[PDB]
Design a protein around this nucleic acid. Structure first.
Ligand SMILES: [Mg+2]
Ligand SMILES: [Zn+2]
Ligand SMILES: [Zn+2]
Ligand SMILES: [Zn+2]
Lengths: 271, 57, 1456, 101, 107
DNA sequence: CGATAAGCAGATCTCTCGATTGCGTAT
RNA sequence: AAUCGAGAG
């Protein structure tokens, strides 16, 4: 940035041969577009380029404290006279040549010296890319923060933007397929997310998925539909369980509702 | 490597700001030439960059 | 999501219900008893909260399932509350039901027959029987035996109705639930509960039951019966209640009234047949979530315990305390002990009961606790923005996304993104290996995770994830060679390996810059991988859509992972499809500043190019090897000038650029338009303001911002229309490359020479500014009504200026008048000095050039830099003034100088003085504050609108409706045409000129075999003929013999099915001009264009409308702007801040009669006619003499239409009565000519303590009346009350109307606007007011008097004229859709929680706000939402219904 | 036991057959909507990526989405769009029966 | 159709709906002196017969409840004498597409 | 019953950093 | 994890 609020990021390191060069032989180290001025109206930067050129030519320092000039003694006139008395022109323009074609440019180019500050907002503190990494515990969504390798957030407005485009698979890929996609198990009989478990197998058998809610105890019920826990409590009951594709915050919401004493029944399509 | 401004207020010395340089005097061309600085961007000379222009740690 | 792991099942819908205590114990894994989680040595304690039965915990295998922490889902558990507790969610409804029954008969205090009536009505409302509920009220007209007959008849009628509705198909066994039946059910239940609350004695036993009081929660006290209550009780024949006893009371009541409670607690037919029970309202067995959901955090060494565990352990401590203390009561019952220590243990038991109830209350909700940081409860965990819905369902953190700063790149394609090499090695894509992929997937695997293009992982057939990160070249080569090996396992013979290849150049990416105000701020880009930096490179044309600049902005970059998301981003969300925004159909892309200022130079007449320069420019901007040409070989033009030597032109450069991008075997564009630079800027006789294209050759005018940019009907827009969006994207890219290579060859610059004036220019400027010396003094002399040319130091002028300073409104008048004068001076200076006073002139003057050209800036900026900054305006006034009348320490008090008021004569070229600098800083600070306030206030409107509109879309019936089927509109805007395709429908000259290209693109020949061409056209001709015969009649008198064609024929299937506006305009065009394109083929092409310009089924029109009403609201006596939008759509306030009625005047009423009517209608208070009032208190018992001095009759009888008689009547009737009422209330607060004679006698007799009365009946000048008080009375001011009474007493006022002002007529018609709304008051004034055209501002009032549709019209008009003052063009389709959503139930529903209650999907409202309340109401009614709104599917994880979810996809397998 | 399933299957098939709109009277747009085109391309690309048979000449191409676009150009996509009316009734248009744009 | 000059007592208001199938409607001499259907904002409402009402419902595959609703107490509904359950056709003059037919249901 | 004067409730983009997080007490 | 403070668009 200059000392006139003309902030901007560095867009390219232009090679010096491709930089435009002047009749003096010098190539500017900063290029600022002329379109930054008409709306911002920072004429102080223009007069500072003028005065800086004049000062670097005459080996002097010019003061810029406000209200030393007026409308009868214009800084343009002052620094222009100083520039004319050194061999450069009144208006601070210089004949420059294109560094790519070598032809002289269509008009004289406004050059000068202005004081430039380098701000602390580097790009090395701003870029972040995540493919996969650490996740939150109770949601299984990516963690927050650049310093922890955590994903960026697709909020409510981005969700509305995805709906507005009609891009349904885009919204699915953002909010489900790449955030907290889990292939959970749902009891087809009772429609509860988290009342099921893997059974502890016997020797040479295979573990199965079984519902706790939809199973009665083997003791209370006076070889295929009998399953065991780690504690050994035998069960004979609900094996009508399937697999769905849900988020994980859905399961956490189910637990937070169960804590409230509210049940959610999820009806699966094929029964 | 900071520098003192060529164009400075009289109060730049009164507060001794030269003890704490804040920037560098740069040769600035107000020119639409590159195509890579239109909205608010700006272009820095590659050779000046390699000569220590605007370096910091 | 892995595409190689399909899921067979799918959650169709969800149903809310109560978790009963029996099933909780049935499914549980362990009961939690000891309030300790961990013993010494850091291990879980059996029976504690971290029990191994609740799930694995820190390397301990779960004891329920036997799996480690990664593979253990968690397991539920419970704790046993010794005493039932009130469920804090259901406390209000349980309390309502408790205080509605009778404790003796265990029924409600309401009549049993009325309870049966409500049960029948709700059973009807459970089905599609919305009107039978009102046809059941007639059964009354047609004691116990009579009541039994009545109830039998009602049951018979209900059963008959439901059977008929089921048998004829109007309802199924699962009921018909919609928004209107939900509204009716809610109203019926609300009135049912109110009727239960409005009882004092039971109708079936007459025995009074004790009242109840509510201190909050966790407690309930019953007031004991009064003496009079027990008096009636015996003839008929503070206390703290217990949780078990209230459970028993409500259990008895529910057991008795199950019949009505089944239809109160079920909004659908209760096919389960399970009983409704009171214990559901009671928590007796809390459920503990699994250890997985209650794990403890470990932030280095700080390892706190879970807050939920803390609350559960507090509950457990109280439970063990009350259990142990319960054993003590066993000792004082078997053993005969004196009731003292029994009293002590009983008080401690009551304390334990209340403490455990408060513990459960705090575990569920923080606010329902007691005590005066707090640990949030479950309700607090989901309630708000930082809750769980809005932070983890509606929004989520995502994988395969990236974020970085953006930098510009004009050498990147306009539909592309510049991806740094650092992202390109971290982002991957799963690629199943085929026989056509192995060529490059093998190379990616060999390249590995570092050399782009490479691969980071290999996913085997059996799901193994082999990572290539730590491997060597030979290992990667072996893995790449065994890539496509045939599968040996049978279970995976259908699968192939997946390579997580790096993101290449053929991939597509999703880009987004926050805040996302509209869908154009999230587009698809084709990734182009660059070698150097770590920022994302963006073309300049995307900056308009993203609102992005390269000064520090960063934006997100999402990488879709499956082919469906790829295809959506490439075809639906791609950036070349977003050329026009749906807000108004205007273009949003185009080159911005340097390219515009370069085109002005390159396309002027002064630009000539040799053969070398011409060919170099063309090749540089085209480069045919990258697919830019349509001829595989560059085609040039002959030079404009042949001798002396061959010279081309820049317009020829444009012509050959078009010739090379525009496809061959298609004509060139024929566009006639303008640009921003007037002909007078180029000299005499110029015609460069008139852009002209003919066969694709630029022959006149200069290309500008009006041509390429965000401008309508320019060259790029016309190319878009004629060649599709892809060709316009190519043209944007090619033009960007052309004007960039041109800008390096012939640079562009600005400097101090561009900012200067001539000597004559400065002379004119100073001469006109000298005229501004006396403007302030004249403005002050005329506002103060003083004689003009009075000196600035006149004592009277200074006094009047001081009065004006004290009085805000007078100060505003002075400020506005002087602002107008100084603005006139500024305008004179600017017109005299620009451009005629500038030494360097356009096009050499670059400042003026880019201000005129639209590259950057404006005439105001150029004027302030070169001529004058002008008056500085704070809000809408001049600079603030001190209390001494000084506006700054420099200026003397009450100085009539324009510079003192903020009028700065300085410019930014010569610099501004100190005081001017101060005023300019004031204005700049005000602007910087206002921008922050505006951006803060914009977004809530859009959020609230989009929450409700997010589901409405276009269905294949071409009607738009919500996802629950509720039809909102039968046509989209009444015409079904897309706003993004509407731009050139009416551009008939353009379409006629480009007929052949349009025909080539539309191709009617291949679109005829699936069309019907005759019926729609015949019906359109018939309807047009009938309308021509009948379109000179009032809208009500006309008949509907022939409906509009769109109502009958599908416009997307019957050619000719078009709107009446479009058809009328097309026929008027074909009539007024005749032109070898046949007049028949042109109509055929326009009809086919209308057919192809229709909005597709599945379009998220609700989202689009909400976005296009909210996003433009960032650029923002009667309320205006965003506050008005809040009044209209957010609040739907019946109490509008500034109600108004527009009253048309009959053409035969003159201005004097108009003013007479205005004064007759406008109200006059008594205070507006009285000069002063004199109160002469005397203690000679204490008396007052109130003398009311009026304005002269010749003053007030003229100004207010008030007479002596009317005034005297008002004072005799209303004023003295109000005065005496105020006096007696004040005393109560303190106790803590015979005609004149007869009038005085009557006033004394009627009034309380008046003793004299005389009114000036001969001059209307005064009114003196005595008033005598007592001797106990304390002193009263008797002037403040008199002033208050005199203000609050009216003279002649029509209700709800304050003033009626006759403004200046505008657009011909003469109007008459009042400061209030009273429709029936002016319904009488037929003479002066055309009552048929009385249009108002209050939407609620017109809904009351005129109906729903007039309310809808005024909604559209009021929501539109807010955008009219801000000059923001919003199509009427958005406003119409919003109006029809707001009036869908026949009332004025707002977009908020109260205006959305009657909706079928509960997840939508729960995500919106008050999640607790909407969940309680969802579970009490056993609502079963079918997962239709977009919010519900996002909650559950189903593909949405809008857009690409509007249909399904089936595969045509060959063999059965 | 099983007969309960037989009844449920009969009811499901009957409701499906009642919801289907016969070909002779489908009143939806002859043109393929942009959403349908995008999803046909995406689904066909997925199927090709998962080693389905392909009905076009691969010009040495590797992008599944490009192969699907080629199939759509030559009208060789064996898919069917099932357009859903608001009441749950549906029509069935084959890909080759629709006109793009 | 019954009207009343100033007010109608509550005592006489409980018999108007008390004798079905005959319908009794109430009005005031005031608040009627202007025909609201003549107001330019109020569109043309035409009561739809059940024969074409079933045709509309079968064309759009609708329930009665899924239509836009007009209140039974809406002034135009009182004017038309709209019983509950019968739909009204509204010819709306649109700024964009001229005349298009909308439908509401009384309910 | 009812019409205000009054009381109570829930609302009012994304991203990066650093610094601190609890006092008295009874044994 | 909160709270406070500093920032960026
Ligand atoms: Mg920005
Ligand atoms: Zn189950
Ligand atoms: Zn487990
Ligand atoms: Zn009773």
């Amino acid at each position: 940035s200059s000392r006139h609020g003309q902030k901007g990021v560095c867009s390219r390191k232009w090679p010096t041969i491709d930089m435009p060069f002047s009749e003096t032989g010098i190539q500017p180290d900063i290029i600022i577009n002329p379109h930054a001025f008409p709306s911002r109206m920072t004429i102080g930067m223009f007069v500072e380029s003028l005065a800086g050129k004049a000062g670097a030519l005459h080996g002097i320092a010019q003061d810029s404290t406000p209200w030393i000039f007026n409308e009868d003694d214009t800084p343009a006139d002052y620094f222009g006279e100083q520039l004319a008395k050194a061999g450069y022109n009144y208006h601070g323009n210089e004949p420059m040549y294109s560094g790519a074609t070598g032809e002289e440019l269509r008009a004289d180019i406004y050059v000068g010296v202005v004081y430039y500050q380098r701000l602390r907002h580097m790009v090395n503190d701003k870029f972040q890319v995540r493919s996969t990494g650490p996740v939150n515990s109770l949601t299984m969504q990516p963690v927050k923060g650049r310093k922890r390798h955590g994903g960026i957030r697709v909020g409510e407005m981005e969700r509305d933007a995805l709906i507005g485009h009609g891009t349904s698979f885009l919204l699915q890929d953002r909010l489900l397929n790449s955030s907290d996609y889990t292939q959970a198990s749902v009891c087809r009989e009772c429609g509860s997310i988290l009342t099921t478990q893997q059974s502890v197998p016997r020797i040479g058998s295979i573990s199965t998925v079984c519902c706790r809610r939809c199973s009665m105890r083997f003791e209370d019920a006076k070889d295929s539909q009998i399953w065991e826990d780690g504690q050994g409590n035998k069960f004979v009951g609900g094996n009508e369980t399937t697999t769905v594709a849900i988020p994980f915050v859905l399961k956490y919401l189910d637990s937070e509702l169960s804590a409230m004493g509210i049940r959610l029944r999820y009806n699966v399509e094929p029964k | 490597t900071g520098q003192t401004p060529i164009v400075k207020a009289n109060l730049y010395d009164d507060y001794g700001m030269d003890n704490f340089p804040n920037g560098f005097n740069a040769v600035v061309a107000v020119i639409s030439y590159t195509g890579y600085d239109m909205d608010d961007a700006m272009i820095i000379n590659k050779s000046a960059d390699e000569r220590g222009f605007g370096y910091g740690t | 999501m892995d595409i190689s792991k399909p899921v067979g099942s799918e959650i169709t819908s969800v149903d809310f219900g109560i978790l009963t205590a029996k099933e909780i114990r049935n499914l549980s894994a362990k009961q939690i008893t000891n309030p300790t989680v961990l013993d010494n040595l850091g291990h879980p304690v059996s029976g504690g909260l971290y029990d191994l039965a609740l799930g694995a915990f820190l390397r301990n295998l779960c004891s329920t399932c036997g799996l480690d922490e990664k593979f253990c889902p968690g397991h539920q558990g419970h704790i046993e509350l010794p005493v039932p507790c009130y469920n804090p969610l259901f406390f209000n409804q349980l309390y309502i039901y408790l205080r509605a029954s009778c404790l003796f008969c265990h029924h409600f205090r309401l009549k049993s027959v009325e309870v049966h009536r409500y049960a029948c009505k709700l059973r009807l409302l459970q089905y599609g029987l919305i009107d039978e509920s009102y046809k059941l009220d007639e059964i009354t007209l047609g004691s116990s035996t009579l009541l039994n007959e009545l109830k039998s008849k009602r049951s018979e009628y209900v059963d008959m109705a439901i059977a008929k509705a089921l048998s004829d198909g109007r309802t199924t066994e699962r009921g018909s639930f919609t928004a209107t039946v939900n509204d009716e059910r809610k109203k019926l239940v609300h009135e049912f509960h109110k009727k239960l609350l409005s009882r004092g004695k039971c109708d079936n036993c007459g025995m009074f039951s004790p009242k109840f009081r509510k201190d909050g929660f966790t407690k309930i006290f019953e007031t004991a019966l009064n003496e009079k209550q027990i008096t009636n009780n015996r003839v008929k024949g503070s206390t703290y209640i217990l949780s078990t006893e209230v459970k028993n009371i409500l259990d008895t009541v529910f057991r008795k009234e199950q019949c009505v409670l089944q239809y109160v607690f079920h909004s659908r037919p209760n096919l389960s047949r399970k009983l409704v029970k009171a214990d559901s309202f009671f928590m007796d067995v809390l459920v503990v979530p699994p250890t997985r959901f209650r794990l403890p955090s470990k932030l280095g060494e700080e390892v706190h315990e879970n807050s939920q565990n803390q609350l559960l352990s507090k509950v457990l401590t109280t439970s063990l305390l009350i259990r142990d203390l319960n054993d003590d009561l066993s000792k004082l019952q078997k053993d005969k002990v004196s009731l003292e220590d029994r009293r002590v243990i009983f008080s401690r038991l009551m304390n334990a009961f209340v403490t455990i109830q408060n513990d459960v209350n705090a575990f569920i909700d923080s606010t329902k606790a007691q005590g005066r940081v707090p640990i949030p409860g479950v309700k607090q965990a989901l309630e708000k923005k930082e809750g769980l819905f809005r932070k983890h369902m509606m929004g989520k953190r995502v994988n395969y996304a990236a974020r970085s700063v953006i930098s510009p790149d004009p050498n990147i394609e306009t539909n592309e993104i510049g991806v740094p090499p650092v992202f390109a090695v971290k982002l991957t894509y799963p690629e199943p290996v085929t026989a056509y992929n192995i060529a490059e997937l093998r190379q990616a695997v060999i390249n590995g995770p570092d050399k782009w293009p490479g691969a980071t992982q290999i996913q085997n057939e059996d799901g193994s994830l082999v990572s290539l990160i730590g491997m060597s070249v030979e290992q990667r080569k072996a893995l790449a060679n065994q890539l496509l090996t045939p599968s040996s396992n049978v279970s995976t013979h259908t699968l192939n390996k997946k390579v997580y290849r790096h993101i290449k150049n053929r991939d597509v990416v999703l880009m987004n810059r926050q805040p996302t105000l509209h869908k154009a701020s999230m587009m698809g880009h084709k990734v182009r991988v660059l070698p150097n930096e770590k920022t994302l490179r963006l073309h300049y044309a995307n900056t308009g859509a993203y609102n992005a600049d390269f000064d520090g902005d960063e934006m997100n970059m999402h990488f879709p992972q499956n082919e469906n998301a790829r295809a959506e981003a490439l075809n639906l969300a791609n950036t070349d499809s977003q050329y026009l925004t749906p807000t108004s159909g205007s273009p949003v892309r185009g080159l911005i500043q340097d390219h515009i200022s370069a085109g002005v130079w390159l396309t002027s007449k002064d630009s000539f190019f040799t053969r070398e320069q011409y060919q170099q420019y063309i090749y540089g901007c085209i480069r045919p090897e990258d697919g830019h040409t349509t001829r595989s070989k560059i085609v040039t033009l002959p030079p404009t000038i042949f001798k002396p030597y061959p010279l081309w032109t820049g317009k020829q450069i444009i012509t050959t650029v078009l010739l090379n991008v525009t496809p061959p075997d298609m004509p060139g564009i024929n566009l006639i338009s303008k640009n921003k630079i007037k002909n007078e800027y180029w000299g005499k006789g110029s015609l460069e303001n008139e852009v002209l294209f003919k066969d694709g050759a630029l022959l006149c005018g200069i290309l500008d911002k009006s041509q390429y940019g965000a401008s309508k009907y320019g060259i790029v827009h016309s190319l878009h229309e004629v060649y599709g969006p892809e060709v316009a994207a190519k043209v944007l890219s090619v033009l960007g490359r052309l004007f960039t290579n041109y800008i390096t060859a012939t640079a562009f610059t600005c400097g101090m020479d561009d900012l200067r004036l001539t000597a004559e220019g400065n002379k004119w400027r100073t001469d006109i500014l000298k005229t501004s010396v006396d403007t302030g003094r004249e403005a002050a002399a005329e506002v103060t009504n003083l004689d003009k040319d009075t000196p600035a130091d006149d004592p009277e002028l200074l006094k009047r200026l001081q009065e004006i300073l004290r009085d805000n409104n007078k100060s505003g008048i002075l400020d506005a008048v002087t602002s107008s004068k100084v603005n006139a001076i500024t305008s004179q200076v600017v017109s005299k000095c620009v451009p005629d006073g500038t030494m360097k002139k356009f096009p050499c003057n670059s400042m003026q050039a880019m201000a005129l050209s639209g590259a950057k800036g404006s005439n105001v900026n150029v004027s302030q830099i070169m001529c004058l900054l002008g008056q500085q305006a704070l809000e809408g006034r001049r600079v603030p003034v001190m209390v001494s009348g000084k506006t700054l320490p420099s200026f003397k008090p009450y100085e009539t100088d324009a510079m003192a008021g903020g009028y700065v004569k300085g410019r930014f070229y010569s610099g501004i003085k100190p005081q001017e600098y101060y005023f300019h800083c004031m204005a700049g600070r005000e602007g910087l504050i206002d921008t922050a306030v505006k951006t803060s206030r914009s977004g809530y409107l859009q959020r609230c609108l989009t929450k409700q509109l997010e589901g409405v879309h276009v269905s294949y019936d071409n009607s738009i409706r919500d996802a629950d089927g509720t039809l909102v509109q039968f046509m989209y805007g009444g015409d079904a045409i897309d706003i993004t395709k509407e731009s050139h429908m009416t551009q008939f000259e353009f379409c006629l000129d480009n007929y052949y290209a349009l025909l080539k693109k539309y191709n009617p020949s291949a679109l005829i075999e699936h069309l019907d061409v005759e019926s729609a056209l015949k019906y359109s001709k018939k309807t047009l003929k009938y309308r021509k015969k009948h379109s000179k009649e009032p809208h009500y008198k006309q008949s509907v013999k022939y409906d509009p064609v769109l109502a009958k024929y599908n416009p997307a299937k019957y050619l000719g099915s078009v709107s009446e506006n479009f058809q009328d305009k097309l026929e008027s065009f074909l009539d007024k001009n005749s032109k070898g394109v046949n007049e028949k083929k042109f109509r055929a092409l326009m009809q086919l264009k209308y057919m192809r310009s229709l909005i597709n089924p599945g379009e998220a029109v609700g989202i689009i409308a909400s976005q296009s009403v909210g996003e433009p609201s960032t650029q923002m006596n009667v309320t205006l702007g965003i506050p008005r939008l809040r009044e209209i759509v957010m609040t739907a306030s019946a109490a509008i801040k500034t109600p108004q009625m527009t009253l048309p005047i009959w053409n035969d009423v003159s201005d004097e009669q108009a003013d007479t009517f205005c004064k007759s209608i406008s109200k006059v208070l008594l205070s507006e006619v009285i000069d002063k009032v004199i109160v002469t208190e005397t203690t000679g018992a204490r008396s007052y003499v109130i003398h009311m001095r009026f304005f002269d009759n010749n003053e007030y009888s003229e100004e207010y239409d008030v007479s002596k008689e009317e005034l005297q009547n008002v004072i005799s009737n209303q004023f003295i009565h109000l005065l005496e009422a105020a006096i007696v209330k004040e005393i109560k607060k303190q106790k803590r000519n015979k005609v004149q004679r007869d009038r005085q006698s009557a006033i004394i007799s009627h009034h309380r303590f008046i003793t004299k009365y005389n009114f000036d009946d001969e001059s209307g000048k005064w009114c003196e009346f005595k008033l005598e008080l007592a001797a106990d009375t304390e002193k009263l001011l008797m002037v403040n009350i008199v002033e208050e009474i005199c203000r609050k007493s009216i003279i002649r006022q029509i209700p709800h109307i304050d003033r009626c002002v006759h403004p200046e007529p505008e657009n011909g018609k003469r109007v008459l606007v009042t400061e209030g709304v009273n429709f029936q008051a002016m319904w009488d004034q037929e003479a002066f007011i055309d009552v048929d055209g009385i249009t108002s501002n209050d939407v609620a009032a017109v809904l009351k008097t005129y109906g729903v549709e007039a309310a809808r019209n005024t909604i559209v008009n009021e929501i539109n004229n807010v955008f009219s003052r801000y000059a923001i063009s919003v199509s009427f389709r958005h406003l119409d859709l919003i109006a029809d959503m707001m009036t869908r139930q026949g009332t004025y529903l707002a977009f908020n929680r109260q205006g959305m209650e009657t909706s079928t999907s509960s997840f939508m409202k729960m995500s919106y706000e008050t999640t607790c309340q909407f969940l309680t109401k969802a579970v009490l009614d056993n609502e079963r939402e079918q997962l239709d709104s977009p919010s519900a599917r996002i909650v559950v994880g189903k593909l949405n219904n809008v857009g690409t979810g509007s249909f399904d996809v089936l595969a045509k397998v060959p063999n059965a | 036991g099983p007969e309960d399933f037989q009844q449920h299957e009969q009811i499901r098939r009957k409701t499906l057959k009642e919801k289907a709109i016969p070909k002779d009277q489908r009143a939806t747009t002859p043109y393929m909507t942009k959403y349908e085109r995008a999803r046909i391309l995406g689904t066909r690309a997925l199927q090709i990526s998962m080693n389905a048979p392909v009905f076009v000449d691969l010009e040495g191409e590797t992008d599944p989405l490009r192969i699907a676009m080629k199939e759509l150009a030559e009208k060789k996509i064996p898919l069917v769009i099932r357009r859903y009316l608001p009441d749950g009734s549906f029509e069935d248009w084959s890909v080759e029966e629709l006109i793009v744009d | 159709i019954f009207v009343y000059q100033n007010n109608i007592t509550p005592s006489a208001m409980k018999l108007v709906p008390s004798i079905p199938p005959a319908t009794i409607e109430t009005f005031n001499e005031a608040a009627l002196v202007v025909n609201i259907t003549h107001h330019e904002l109020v569109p043309k409402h035409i009561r739809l017969s059940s024969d074409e009402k079933r045709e509309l419902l079968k064309r759009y595959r609708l329930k009665e409840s899924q239509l836009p609703r007009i209140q039974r107490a809406d002034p135009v509904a009182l004017y038309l004498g709209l019983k509950r359950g019968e739909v009204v056709k509204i010819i709306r003059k649109s700024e964009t597409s001229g005349r298009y037919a909308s439908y509401r249901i009384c309910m």
